[PDB]
Design a protein around this nucleic acid. Structure first.
Lengths: 337, 151, 138
RNA sequence: CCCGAGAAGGGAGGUGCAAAGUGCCUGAAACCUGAUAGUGAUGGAACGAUACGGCAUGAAAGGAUCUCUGGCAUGAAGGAAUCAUUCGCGAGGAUGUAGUACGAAUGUCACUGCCAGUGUCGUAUCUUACGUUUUGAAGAACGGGCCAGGGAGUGUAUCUU
RNA sequence: AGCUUGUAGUCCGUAAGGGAGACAACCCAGCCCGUGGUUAAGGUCCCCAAGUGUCGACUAAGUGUUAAUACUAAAGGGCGU
RNA sequence: UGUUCGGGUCGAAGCAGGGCUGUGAAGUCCUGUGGACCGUUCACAAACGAAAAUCCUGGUAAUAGUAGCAGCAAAGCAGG
RNA sequence: CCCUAACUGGAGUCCGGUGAAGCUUACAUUCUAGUGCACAGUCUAGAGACCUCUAGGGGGAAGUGAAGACCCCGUGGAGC
RNA sequence: GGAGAUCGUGAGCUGGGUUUAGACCGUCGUGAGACAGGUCGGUUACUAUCUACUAGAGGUGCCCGAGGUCUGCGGGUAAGC
């Protein structure tokens, strides 16, 4: 038999396609430190999409210098609290948590997530971590941070979300000093990301529940006469006669969406403080209006509205210093029109 | 057709017995309900049965799980056997009355025995395709219940 | 506590397996990355990448990557590990890359007949080299 | 008499040597419900046989110089250890110790209160069911879901032995 | 041709048990029951009872680690050793 | 069946489980249940022994609280 | 059809009631290779495998339905 | 590009071909009838027991009791061509 070839339906790069074990994306890698100390990640909540008219500043592009309409995602980004500093020791079996110091004073609504750590050992915990770093038991340092969604109104929840973030510094001592400076403080998104820079966005995608292989993997439907013989939206064959089994690579029904996904190289087009600049007439549908500080991300982002979106400094960015975008018009017309 | 001996015989002094005689209910569902309610106090068993009949409380189905979805809370497969619960509650009422007649105190007694027994089947028929008639039977269940005032 | 540095992999495994089946001791093996496999580097790497990428690794053989876990697998192949005896033997065995901190400074032993200087040539590679060429971080 | 809507049924209480309680003598198995013994959510499959253990049972019908644990005597085949001398390149061999100590078992004397058996589980070795068709059956060859009962070389005549 | 058809011997068929990974017919062996010992075939690094046995060489190819068997690749070449 | 010698309401046959004997076909005994019949010597007969026949008759499982109770045809709701 | 999307009613899914049938020697959480009547979940050696439940399409069980209607054979038939 | 997966894949589909019963043409045969010749027409059964997979749950094991944040033994990927 002389066969016609096709690329495989869907990607096996995301198998098993199960539901994410948490509603928060977890970062498995952190990029290289390339400058002054700072947090490598922030976290906001997706609001919705709008579009801007901007001058194409992208070097070498055909439309560079002319007016272009660019879709943007609005992400409401209230200040996060640096709740703790955690130290990690590297050994043959990998990284292990070795020490943690919690900030002396923490927000009372953190009790919705965890019983509040007391204002106990912070000075001696920090000196213990300093001794550990001096004696070489510490491989690196991360900052445990959490969001404060109570200030938002389109997100109904008041329980904070907690996550670890890397610190970008040239040396472990510099990392420890910066973490001590930022410990217990409220960091704004301008203290993590700058306008016009590329970032990576992680989020839990839109949940679709249980979906068939046609929607879930993009398999072809039965065609022509076969379309009305009783197996229309349904895979042609589960396998060969031998091997006597259904491969895991055969497209099948199952959970669709509500997965963790990372998008790369999303450009920040605006860091705003007043949500009236971006909120349309009538508000964002099912969300409301922006009230705190916000961010405009060029293009689309994984997740629906109100989903927690984690932003991190780019890990596979190609282009060098991009610049500050020239946003000439932010559309606030009614999205419900 | 006739009366039935009990699988277990508790001592007459501190124990009351009752028998639901060939109820036209589901033996599988009644077995699950009996397994759930065995060992409880009579009052708490009554409250549980009332919750089941009111749909506020599912009974786990560990032996006859097929056809049952999972229920909210710390539970696997479970159902709401309304007819079985009603019949078992009638039998429980009979047993509590018998205890009161003996002079025992049902408020302090426990369901120590709660079993089903398949009885004689009434044989009906289900006309099928192509001239075939297959069975459809009336299964009957005897419910043996033994409460005791000690454990 | 056996130091696997400069020891033939199969001969050390046979010795430790027979000791475990004699069944009066817990055996610890340290520096599993420093064990020796005789034969040409190309041939050893070829056979080990074949074994690593062989099976139905979604639902088939799962050949380990760390050198200590590979040595544990090699000893497992010389045991009745499906039996209760072999299960106890494998439960009484611990293998380490380098020296674990708790065993640090403990008195070690070496198998004289497993020593690598009894080999007649230089055609050998280390288990750590095999593991890191298969992509194990240790 | 009590419960129960009840001319159902159940409980309690009676009758009778015995409930044998009306399709009711006896009342097996399959099947189903519950209890008890063993095991059990890291585990490998003809579901067993053999040996040895854990747990349970071991009233009758089984053992009481019987069971346990030792001593002593005799002990077939077989038969060391250790050491001395010698040979061999060596691993080892030969001679003596030594046909000795031991040794299946057969007797005898103490000690002991269990043992046999039964159920289940575990460790070790072995075994891919049964009947049939087949040169070849665990077969991806045919037959049986299970249990109970029924189910197949008989008589007349004649010939031979 | 694990094809078909002869012949001599021996087997399976109807042949246990032990050993070859398993193996109708390949090796020991024909086998009443129980106990003890010593052997056969085969094996003695572990799985697995007993050698990480001895002597003298070869092989660098994981070649090989495969009595018989249809279950084991040839001609040709090699200043490989 | 003939014949010899017996057992049984102070509990026969049968049934469930167990002990002992016998290589075994099987026999015997114990406990419970059961309520009236049952064996034994030497012989003689047979409608005399079942695990199998897509065996027959009866009973009863897994499948399984599963399929079905959806084209008929807008199918009911309120109050009493 | 390129290339599928949304929506409507009935099923399905979940709940109450009612309630069958068909495959079944046994066991069974398997996968690879070999062996074997040369097409193995059970043999051999490895590799895996914590159990239970729900939904889902049918890879496999040389799945089930059925003493192959093709071929041959039978000193078996029928019609022409 | 070619090939293997029971010439992979009908308890997934199709039914055009071949392989039933009807009929025509040509050629054989006295005939019934025949043709690895042509032509027109010609029913594609099953509610999934086990296993495998895809997903979602309840347990038990691990475990001071609970919660949170992590690591990564491993598995997958075309972390694009």
């Amino acid at each position: 038999m002389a066969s016609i070839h096709r690329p495989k339906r869907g990607s096996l790069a995301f198998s098993p396609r199960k539901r994410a074990k948490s509603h928060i994306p977890r970062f498995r890698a952190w990029p290289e430190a390339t400058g002054e100390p700072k947090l490598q990640s922030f976290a906001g909540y997706k609001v919705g999409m709008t579009h801007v008219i901007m001058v194409d500043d992208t070097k070498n592009s055909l439309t560079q210098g002319m007016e272009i309409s660019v879709p943007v995602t609005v992400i409401e980004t209230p200040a996060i609290r640096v709740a703790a500093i955690r130290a990690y020791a590297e050994d043959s079996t990998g990284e292990k948590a070795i020490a943690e110091v919690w900030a002396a004073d923490l927000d009372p609504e953190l009790k919705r997530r965890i019983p509040i750590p007391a204002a106990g050992n912070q000075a001696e915990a920090l000196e213990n971590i300093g001794k550990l770093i001096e004696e070489g038991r510490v491989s690196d340092v991360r900052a445990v941070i959490y969001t404060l969604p109570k200030s938002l109104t389109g997100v109904p929840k008041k329980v904070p979300d907690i996550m670890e973030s890397g610190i970008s510094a040239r040396d472990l001592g510099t990392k420890f000093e910066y973490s001590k400076t930022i410990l217990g403080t409220l960091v704004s998104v301008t203290d993590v990301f700058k306008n016009g820079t590329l970032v990576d966005t992680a989020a839990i995608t839109i949940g679709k529940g249980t979906q068939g292989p046609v929607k879930r993997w993009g398999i072809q439907l039965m065609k022509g006469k076969h379309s009305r013989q009783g197996s229309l939206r349904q895979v042609g064959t589960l396998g060969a006669f031998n091997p006597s089994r259904v491969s895991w690579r055969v497209p099948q029904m199952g959970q669709m969406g509500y997965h963790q996904r990372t998008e790369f190289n999303k450009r920040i087009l605006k860091i705003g403080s007043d949500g009236e600049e971006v909120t349309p007439e009538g508000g964002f549908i099912n969300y409301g209006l922006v009230r705190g500080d916000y961010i405009l991300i060029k293009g689309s982002v994984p997740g629906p509205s109100k989903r927690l979106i984690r932003l991190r400094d780019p890990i596979r960015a190609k282009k060098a210093d991009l610049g500050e975008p020239n946003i000439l018009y932010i559309s606030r017309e009614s999205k419900q029109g | 057709m006739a009366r039935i001996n009990y699988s277990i015989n508790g001592d007459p002094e501190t124990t009351s017995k009752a028998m639901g005689s060939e109820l036209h209910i589901s033996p599988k569902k009644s077995r699950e309900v009996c397994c759930k309610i065995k060992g409880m106090k009579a009052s708490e068993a009554r409250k549980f049965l009332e919750d089941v009949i009111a749909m506020k409380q599912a009974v786990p189905f560990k032996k006859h799980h097929d056809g049952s979805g999972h229920r909210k809370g710390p539970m696997a497969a479970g159902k709401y056997p309304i007819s079985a619960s009603k019949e078992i509650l009638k039998v429980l009422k009979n047993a509590e009355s018998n205890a009161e007649y003996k002079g025992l105190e049902p408020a302090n007694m426990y369901i120590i025995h709660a079993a089903i027994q398949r009885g004689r089947v009434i044989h009906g028929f289900m006309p099928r395709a192509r001239g075939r008639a297959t069975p459809k039977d009336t299964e009957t269940v005897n419910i043996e219940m033994i409460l005791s005032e000690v454990r | 506590v056996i130091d696997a540095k400069g020891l033939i992999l199969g001969r050390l495994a046979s010795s430790v397996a027979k000791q475990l089946l004699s069944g009066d001791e817990k055996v610890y093996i340290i520096n599993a990355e420093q064990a020796i496999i005789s034969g040409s580097r190309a041939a050893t790497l070829r056979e080990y990448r074949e074994t690593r990428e062989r099976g139905a690794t979604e639902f088939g053989p799962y050949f380990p990557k760390r050198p200590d876990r590979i040595l544990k697998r090699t000893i497992r192949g010389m045991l009745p590990y499906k039996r209760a005896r072999g299960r106890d033997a494998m439960s009484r065995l611990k293998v380490y890359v380098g020296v674990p901190y708790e065993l640090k400074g403990a008195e070690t032993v070496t198998i004289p007949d497993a020593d690598m200087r009894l080999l007649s040539s230089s055609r050998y590679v280390e288990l750590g080299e095999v593991s890191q060429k298969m992509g194990s971080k240790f």
